[PDB]
Amino acid sequence: SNVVLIGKKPVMNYVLAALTLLNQGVSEIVIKARGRAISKAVDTVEIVRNRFLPDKIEIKEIRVGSQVVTSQDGRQSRVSTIEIAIRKK
Amino acid sequence: SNVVLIGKKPVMNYVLAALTLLNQGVSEIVIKARGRAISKAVDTVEIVRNRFLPDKIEIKEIRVGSQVVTSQDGRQSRVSTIEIAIRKK
Structure with a gap:
């Protein structure tokens, strides 16, 4: 995989998931x-x-x-996204 | 001035400020x-x-x-920072 998808949990979960891969x-x-x-x-x-x-x-x-995002009532909108690629120096 | 500092006001505020400069x-x-x-x-x-x-x-x-942010009780903490530079292509 190599991808850490940020969600609702506390930061720690993700920095750990990140460190785990590295x-x-x-x-x-x-x-x-x-x-x-x-x-x-x-x-x-x-x-x-x-x-x-x-x-x-x-x-x-x-x-x-x-x-692009579509809601229950069918209306559209957009949400920003970010992708940060990091590697071992 | 060329810098638009994001604060607690609604997005449109900053978008407007940005579009203005542009x-x-x-x-x-x-x-x-x-x-x-x-x-x-x-x-x-x-x-x-x-x-x-x-x-x-x-x-x-x-x-x-x-x-870094010392703030109160001098315990000190760290905050994330982002900077985005955009221009007309």
Whole structure:
């Protein structure tokens, strides 16, 4: 996989899921999120690179975008998305 | 000024400020946010380019980081940071 999808749980869950992949071979992982979760996704990246693997992880690419969404009543809208690819320095 | 700082006000506020600079002449503007605002920052950029300024705006750069916050009781904590640079293509 190599992808950590940010959801509703507390940050820790995701930084751990992230560290697990890294500290398990995979040298590049991607943190993905949408809507308000975008902040946690960034938090996750920072916590990982700063509090657990200082100077051992770099950000390869960040990508933001928009995803179309359809509600129960059929109306459309968009939610922002983010994709942060990080790897072992 | 060229910088649009995301605060607690509704998105449209910042989108308007951003579109102003762009329509007002400025070639490249920078949207900044910290913590929970990060989402809104990405939202502001997406709403500004897609929708409003069709195929004319490009994301030149996205920077992510952390900043310390001593605040009260000097316990100190860290907050996530995001910076998005966009310009007319």
